Structure 1
Amino acid sequence: RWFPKTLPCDVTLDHVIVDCTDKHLTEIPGGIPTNTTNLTLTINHIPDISPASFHRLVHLVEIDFRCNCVPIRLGSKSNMCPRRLQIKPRSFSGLTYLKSLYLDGNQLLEIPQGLPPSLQLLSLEANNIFSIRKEQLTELANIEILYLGQNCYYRNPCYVSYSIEKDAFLNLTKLKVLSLKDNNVTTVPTVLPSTLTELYLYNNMIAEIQEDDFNNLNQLQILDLSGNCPRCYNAPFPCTPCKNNSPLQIPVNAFDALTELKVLRLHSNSLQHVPPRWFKNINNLQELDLSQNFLAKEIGDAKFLHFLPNLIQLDLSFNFELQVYRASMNLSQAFSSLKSLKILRIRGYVFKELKSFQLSPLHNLQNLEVLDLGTNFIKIANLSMFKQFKRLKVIDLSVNKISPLYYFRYDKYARSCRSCYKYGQTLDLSKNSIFFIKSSDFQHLSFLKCLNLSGNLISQTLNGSEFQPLAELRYLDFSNNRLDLLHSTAFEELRKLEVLDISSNSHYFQSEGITHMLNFTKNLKVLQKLMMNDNDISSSTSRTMESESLRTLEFRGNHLDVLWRDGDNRYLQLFKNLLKLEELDISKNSLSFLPSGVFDGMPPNLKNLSLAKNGLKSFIWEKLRYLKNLETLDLSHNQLTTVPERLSNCSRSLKNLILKNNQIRSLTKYFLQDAFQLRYLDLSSNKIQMIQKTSFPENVLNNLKMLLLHHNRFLCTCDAVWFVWWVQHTEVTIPYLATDVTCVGPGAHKGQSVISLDLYTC
């Protein structure tokens, strides 16, 4: 480079994007390009905005000035904002091309004035604005999107009811989206402009809908009235219900004007009845969320479903009656109306026994993909019943009591300041009480692609006779179980098995004297991936694992340290006969060193090797000559103190060397000499002081995709003159260059960034 970075911001270029997110700034920086279209300054501590702020920046279409002063309870309690953001007059009115402005999370007291007529989007979430006046909104003639939420709630209280003048929004003739969520609003702020497409009014104090409230809103596609007269039972937040357990009162004709309506969410409204009359003039409804109400009875009746032939998703989760364990699930025949239904969820209805007939109302739903009966405390269920449901993508019985955060969020859509479904048909029996299994349990289920048994009781000496019906099965998640690997024939029946997870089945590996057989993988002739993480495996009766197919083995969280104890050669070839193995994760095996033999004993095609988080205190680098196809080596989070004298005499194939979080204090004189194949190198979080040219030749350095250097101990004396220069001028990506690549001394420069460092005197 002719001139160094200097600017503390990622200047991408598409549109000219300047991104100064979380750069510990107290002023907008100098040097921002004149052609800047989008400028982001979110999470900084810039205490004011003036006409100087954006003076030259005439082509700005977007300003993201979020979270420079987030409200006290929302922010960090180490770094509390002492004084609200100040916005002086005239700061925005120069900006003719400005289309989006984001001033959320700045403790603003009022809608900021003097905004340009070009503005289409204004976002003021998480401020202290709880009174909307018509006069304050006339600057927004041309506004289309308006976020006003999260200014009066339990985490950012205003201590009063929210106030919106009569007809405040009406003369916003182009307004499409309006969000007043999380605000302590008491009524729908009539009259609303008919142009509205989305209206978010959830988590508020609206006790009633008047029948003229949505009179003119023909174009409305999304309505959310959730959390008004909330159902408070086991709320993980402060929850005040409406008096007498009352519901949100919605006149039978309240929706008659909403012809175009695609999404209606009535989550947590304490509803007991879903009067069919609501939906008379709503033909095209696609999505209905009725979760967290009191509709256990209404689900038996449910006449309203007769008016919903277009409905793709219906949510009836968490409608149980308190203190009531129903013996079964009374589903309405009405459900058969729901011709278009792709997704149905009925978690938290709370019943003991599921029988095949209770689901009969759904048998003809042609488009049905997802049936979710999770978290129902179901104790009894003949799983063969799902023979009818071969066409379903997912059948979720997760969290039950079978044995042969989302619904409880306050605001799941809240914005920040910053799987095996793809294998085919899936039956999720996770987190259930299944202690024993046998073939009959899976009879008529030969269609299943993924079976999830994670988090059951299964404490069984699997012999190959247990999943015998499941010959289409590609994925078995057997994690968080108590597999007893006595027989090498475990899992051999699953002849189509591509992926097996036996992670966190440590129980029986923790006790001495117990025969385990890790050689069970010869039998599984299509197995691509095996996960046996966190099993505490320190003993094995067989001494090799063999497979012709296995590409990936995750072996983290075991005791290879015991198996490879110095002077015990028995297990040095444990992975040798995994002949296709490209990827081996042996991180967290409390390996303080590697005996000779470990690398010779690796399989031939090893591409990607993780020894992360072991406590490695030493490492013979020369032994990487045995791993002739090695491309990524992960030695992160260890106690290594030195790099090889010559990486090119260790491994000519290595592209990615991860050394972050070690105890390296310098580099060897010719470290990277000749390592032309190297592309990525992470030396971050070490204790390096100096780096000379001999170690980091330009030949090799300038071909790196990335070089990570942050969190070291750089000495910024005139001995550092080459490195400081090189960093300052190189094209090579070096993340955190303007935040965490800093000098620690000498004196003057202590704390100073290497990129700002001007060492004239040399």
Structure 2
Amino acid sequence: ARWFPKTLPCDVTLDVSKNHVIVDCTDKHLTEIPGGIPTNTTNLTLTINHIPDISPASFHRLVHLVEIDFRCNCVPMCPRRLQIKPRSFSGLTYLKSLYLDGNQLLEIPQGLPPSLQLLSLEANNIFSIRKEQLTELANIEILYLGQNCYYRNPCYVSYSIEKDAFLNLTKLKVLSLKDNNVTTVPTVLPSTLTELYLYNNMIAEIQEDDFNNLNQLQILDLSGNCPRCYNAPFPCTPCKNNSPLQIPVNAFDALTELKVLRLHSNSLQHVPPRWFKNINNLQELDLSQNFLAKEIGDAKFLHFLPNLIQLDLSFNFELQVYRASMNLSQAFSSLKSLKILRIRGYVFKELKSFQLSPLHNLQNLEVLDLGTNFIKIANLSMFKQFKRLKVIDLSVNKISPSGDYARSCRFKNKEASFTSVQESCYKYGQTLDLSKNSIFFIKSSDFQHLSFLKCLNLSGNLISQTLNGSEFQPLAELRYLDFSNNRLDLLHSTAFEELRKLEVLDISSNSHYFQSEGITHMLNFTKNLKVLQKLMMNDNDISSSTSRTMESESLRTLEFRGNHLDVLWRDGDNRYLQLFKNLLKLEELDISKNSLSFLPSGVFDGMPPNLKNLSLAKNGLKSFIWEKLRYLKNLETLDLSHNQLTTVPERLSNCSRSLKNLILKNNQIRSLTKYFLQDAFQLRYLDLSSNKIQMIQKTSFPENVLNNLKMLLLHHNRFLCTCDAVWFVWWVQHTEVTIPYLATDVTCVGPGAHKGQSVISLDLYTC
């Protein structure tokens, strides 16, 4: 509630349905908590700042607070550790969540309210755990005590937990003890635990009674214990004699609701089937970064995982061993419900069709990761049986053509699963990611029996070929093709002619043959592509073109950034003026970073009629005309950021009748016209940030136009806060226009003592 604030430099968000008020003071360099904080707020954000300590009077009048964030308030360049006065949180009866990460605290704070449910104490100096200060947390549910003693934040003392310290926490559900130099699992954990995170510790042995009472546990993490330290870019201490993490056979017996089990980087050598005897509902299993190269050939334990969804076996290669072929066990056929399989880091020479026979009967298999394996010989025709597969990974391996602040400062989710990189090519269907391979030329015979491919990634292969319309012949149903970081010779206009169903084509980073001058550059090759929608050819350094115009009856998006359009539009050269005129259906243009000092008169007449998104960022426009914008009758998102313009148009209404997203970020504008926004009711977005503007007059910014503006930015500029802008000073602190960084970035240059003064916090009584 309270809606209208007074001088708070933090953003305020209201959710009447959720009855939640959010105050975000992230990155504000506040030495002390600002005054005038509303009593109706619920979430308080107090991240990286210069707060010396916490006083009980800080939250004296705040009783509706349910979330307090104090993450990374002093990162070890920082003064002494934060000191919390006694009874500094007892007044918050409605408190439920509290974050105190990165505060260099020595002991657990006391006096916490009994209504607390979440507590985060990561990146602190708490290496001792006793029941006395845990008695007050009898109602907690989620506890985060990780990252208290490890290589980034050392304490030189092993973690000490007294007996049955967590036993009385009956409401505990999630416990995290990562990177805490723990040696022994802290028995006895409460029986209501669901997620246990003990990874990246120094645990060497597991007792048979360690998880004897945990029956509702769902997520268990035991990574980093006795890790594989070979070629490790971080300080890690292998266990002695390389010994693996000793886990008894009857260890995971009481676990019945377990769903996620992570054993990554444990130097394991054998996986006994007795471990998975009781856990029948296991879904995700991680066994990466171990020494299970021989176990994969046996994989006898896979017979006890009928409901497995994810299986990770990455980076299990043997030192000084180069396998001739992948040895997949026949027990892999028992994974009926398997969906994702990762066999990276299993470096081997040749991949054959019969080596993937166990995976032929997996109906639910979708992702098959095989990248970073240095595969030399691989017949691509063997994938004709994996039509149901969604993503096939053939990454940096060497397949060739066939011969004849800190972490806790952000990410409030804390313990979260590794989110897979969702590439733009996955949404189109079947994907064959052949990027960064040893393919140097394309044959139509290699891609045979692959008519089902809806996507193909060939970036980074460094292919030097002159396509003429016969290479991608079998790929009849291909819709997305990536050809970035290659050497494409556009000597023929029939390139990509046989890709009848192609929609998105990417030929970026092909600067080699485009940099040369005098050779033919058939830029009209898009005429044959009937259903092409998007074409990305940026960073190509295109300086000349044999074709006068580019023709396409279906192209909608065109990225032409990082090229040389100044030479194409050189003074006295009107050949390539109407280069984009024939693109009838084009709606978005991205001609940026083209070193365009000036725009020759006539290019706007040669623009496509349906243009809607024009970008000219980082171009260095010394003088950009404005009266020619009348030709574009559909322009809505003109962008001129990071340019060297110096004058705004006399009347924006006379220039464009549909512009609504004007952007002039990081420009050099000292003053605006006296009728800049006169009768321009169609505008909704405007940006003048990072400029050299001095003052704004009333006649240039009418309130009628300003009422409908969704966003307006005037920060990080050179405004002068003198007595000549009393109307601006009154309006900036009396309007409802969303102006971000109104009290943090926009300051006053002068005069005199007014340096660094906040414009919204100005009151010139003498004016």
Superposition TM-score, scaled by structure 2 size: 0.96
Give the conservation status (yes or no) of the 8 Å contact 1:339–1:366. yes
Whole-angstrom CA distance in 1 between matches of 2:394 and 2:320: 22
CA deviation vs aligned residue, 1:310-365 (integer Å, no higher than 9, x gap): 00000000000122211110000010010000000011100111111111010001
Residues in 2 aligned to 1:450 and 1:475: alpha-carbon distance in whole angstroms: 5
Match of residue 406 from structure 2: 414
Contact 2:352–2:379 (CA<8 Å) still a contact in 1? yes
Q: Structure 1 residue runs of 4+, over 2 Å off?
A: 1-5, 413-416
> Separation in 2 of the partners of 1:263 and 1:710?
48
- How far off is 1:234 after superposition? 2.2
Give the whole-Å Cα distance in 2 for the aligned partners of 1:668 and 1:234: 63
Q: Is the 8 A contact 1:212 1:254 kept in 2?
A: yes
C-alpha distance in 1 between matches for 2:586 and 2:128:
64
| Matched residue, 1:262 | 259
CA RMSD of aligned residues (A): 1.3
Deviation per CA, 1:572-624, whole angstroms, max 9, x where unpaired? 11111011000000011011111011111110001000100111111011111
CA distance in 2, matches of 1:345, 1:712: 51
CA positional deviation for 1:713: 0.3
> What secondary structure is seen at the aligned counterpart in 2 of 1:336?
helix
User: Cα offset for 1:57?
Assistant: 0.8
Tell me if the contact between 2:71 and 2:408 (Cα under 8 Å) persists in the aligned partners.
no
The answer (yes or no) to whether the contact 2:340–2:368 under 8 Å persists in 1 is yes
Of residues 101, 104, 112, the one that matches 1:104 is 101
Greater relative CO, 1 or 2 (CA 8 Å, sep 6+): 1
Q: Distance in 2 between matches of 1:118 and 1:270?
A: 42
CA contact (8 A) 1:3 1:729 kept: no
SS in structure 2 opposite 1:282?
A: coil
Q: Shift of the alpha carbon at 1:4?
A: 6.3
Cα contact 1:39–1:62 (8 A) shared by 2: yes
Answer whether contact 2:123 2:408 (CA < 8 A) is retained: no
Q: Is the 8 A contact 2:309 2:340 kept in 1?
A: yes
Which structure 2 residues correspond to residues 510-589 of structure 1 after superposition, within 5 A? 510-589=515-594
Compared CA separation, residues 2 and 56, structure 1 to 2 (3 A): closer
- C-alpha separation between the residues in 2 aligned to 1:679 and 1:550? 27
| Shift of residue 258, structure 1, vs aligned partner | 0.7
Distance 1:643 1:325 in 2: 66
TM-score by length of 1: 0.97
* Partners of 2:97 and 2:118 within 8 A in 1: yes
Cα separation, 2, equivalents of 1:548 and 1:233: 56
* Cα distance per residue 1:50-76 (max 9 Å; x no partner): 1111011111111112111123xxxxx
Offset of 1:463 from its aligned partner? 0.9
Q: Is the 8 A contact 1:4 1:755 kept in 2?
A: no
Q: Deviations 1:509-548 (Å, cap 9, x if unpaired)?
A: 1222221111100000111100001011111111111001
3-state DSSP class of the match of 1:740?
Answer: coil
The structure 2 residue matched to 1:287, chosen from 284, 289, 292, is 284
Partner of 1:176: 173
Distance in 2, Cα, partners of 1:294 & 1:498:
44
Once residues 636 and 547 of structure 2 are traced to their aligned partners in structure 1, the CA distance between those partners, rounded to angstroms, is 30
Distance apart, 1:231 and its partner CA? 0.7
Residue of structure 2 in register with 1:163 after alignment:
160
CA contact (8 A) 1:331 1:359 kept: yes
Distance apart, 1:399 and its partner CA: 1.1
Q: What is aligned with 1:681?
A: 686
Distance 2:5 2:34 in 1: 15
Shift of 1:2: 11
| Aligned residues of 1:5 and 1:755 also touching (Cα < 8 A) | no
CA distance in 1 between partners of 2:23 and 2:579 (Å): 51
CA contact (8 A) 1:64 1:102 kept: yes
Q: Offset at 1:416?
A: 4.1
Residue 469 (structure 1) aligned to one of 465, 468, 474: 474
Deviates more, 1:230-239 or 1:322-331: 230-239
**1:147-199 CA-partner distances (Å, limit 9, x unpaired):** 00111111111111111111111111111100000111111011111111000
Unaligned runs of 5+ in 2: 411-423
SS of residue in 1 equivalent to 2:381: helix
Q: Distance in 2 between matches of 1:627 and 1:573?
A: 14
Confirm or deny: 8 A CA contact 1:527 1:549 kept in the other structure. yes
> Offset of 1:253 from its aligned partner?
1.1
Task: Note if 1:702 corresponds to 2:723.
Answer: no
Instruction: Using the TM superposition, give the Cα deviation of residue 415 of structure 1 relative to its aligned residue in structure 2, in angstroms.
Output: 4.4
SS of alignment partner, residue 638 of structure 2: strand
CA contact (8 A) 1:314 1:343 kept: yes
Distance 1:26 1:414 in 2: 20
| 8 Å contact from structure 1 (residues 530, 553) kept in 2 | yes
Contact 2:748 2:759 in 1 (8 A): yes
Query: Structure 1's 414 and 452: CA in aligned 2 closer, same or farther, altered over 3 A?
Result: farther
- SS of equivalent residue, structure 1 residue 686: coil
Deviation at 1:414, TM superposition (A): 8.6
Q: Deviations over 1:119-139 (max 9, x none)?
A: 111001111111111111001
For residue 310 of structure 1, the aligned residue among 307, 310, 315 is 307
8 Å Cα contact 2:506/2:537 also seen in 1 = yes
**Contact 2:101 / 2:408 at 8 angstroms: preserved in 1?**
no
Kept in 2: contact 1:4–1:729 (CA 8 A): no
What SS does the aligned partner of 1:16 have? strand
Q: Distance in 1 between matches of 2:727 and 2:352?
A: 76
CA drift at 1:240: 1.2
Task: Provide the C-alpha distance between the structure 1 equivalents of 2:174 and 2:315, rounded to a whole number of angstroms.
Answer: 29
Distance 2:490 2:268 in 1: 51
| Deviation (angstroms), 1:3 | 6.7
- Residue 669 of structure 1 deviates from its aligned partner by 1.3
Conservation of the 8 A alpha-carbon contact between 1:659 and 1:683 = yes
State the alpha-carbon separation in 2 of the partners of residues 376 and 3 from structure 1.
60
Q: Indicate conservation of the 8 Å contact 1:2/1:729, yes or no.
A: no
SS, match of residue 745 in structure 1: coil
Q: In the TM superposition, what whole-angstrom CA distance separates every residue of 1:644-694 from its partner, at most 9, and x where no partner exists? A: 111111111100011001111111111111111111111000111101111
SS of residue paired to 2:488: coil
Residue 724 of structure 1 and its aligned partner are, at CA, apart by 1.4
- Structure 1 window deviating more from structure 2 (505-514 vs 572-581): it is 505-514
SS in 1 for 2:727: helix
Q: How many residues align?
A: 746
Conserved? CA contact 2:96–2:118, under 8 Å = yes
Q: Tell me by how many angstroms 1:271 deviates.
A: 0.7
Q: Deviations over 1:262-288 (max 9, x none)?
A: 000001111111111111100000001
Alpha-carbon spacing, 1:670–1:522, altered in 2? closer, same or farther (3 Å): same
SS of equivalent residue, structure 2 residue 388: coil
Q: Give the secondary structure class of the aligned counterpart of 1:334.
A: helix
CA displacement at 1:32 relative to structure 2: 1.2
- Distance change (3 Å), C-alpha of 1:178 and 1:164: same
CA contact (8 A) 2:166 2:189 kept: yes
Structure 2 residue aligned with 1:336, among 333, 337, 340? 333
**SS state of the match for residue 333, structure 2?**
helix
Q: Is the CA contact 2:521–2:545 (under 8 Å) kept in the aligned structure 1?
A: yes
Q: Secondary structure at the match of 1:83?
A: coil
1:74 aligns with: none
Give how far 1:236 is off.
2.1
SS in 2 for 1:359: helix
Q: Distance in 2 between matches of 1:446 and 1:394?
A: 15
Look up the SS of the partner of 2:456 in the other structure.
strand
Q: 1:389 to 1:452 in 2, by over 3 A?
A: same
Question: Take 1:38 and 1:2, find their aligned partners in 2: how far apart are those partners?
Answer: 15
1:3–1:315 Cα change, 3 Å: closer
Q: Deviation at 1:39?
A: 1.1
* Deviations, residues 399-450 of structure 1 (Å, cap 9, x unaligned): 111110xxxxxxxx99442411110111100110110112111111111111
Q: Name the CA distance, whole Å, in 2 between partners of 1:53 and 1:467.
A: 68
**Conserved in 2, the CA contact under 8 Å of 1:4 and 1:728?**
no
Q: Determine the C-alpha separation between the residues in 2 that align with 1:426 and 1:505.
A: 22
Decide whether the 8 Å contact of 1:207 with 1:249 is kept in 2.
Answer: yes
Pair 253,143 (structure 1): closer, same or farther in 2 beyond 3 Å? same
Which of 471, 479, 488 is the equivalent residue of 2:484?
479
Q: Do the aligned partners of residues 209 and 570 (structure 1) sit closer, same or farther apart at CA in structure 2, a change above 3 Å counting?
A: same
Distance 1:4 1:47 in 2: 26
Deviation track 1:378-412 (CA, whole Å, cap 9, x = no partner) reads 111111111111101100111111110xxxxxxxx
Provide the C-alpha distance between the structure 2 equivalents of 1:433 and 1:564, rounded to a whole number of angstroms: 38
Q: Measured at CA, do residues 239 and 357 of structure 1 come closer, stay the same or move farther in structure 2, by a change above 3 Å? A: same
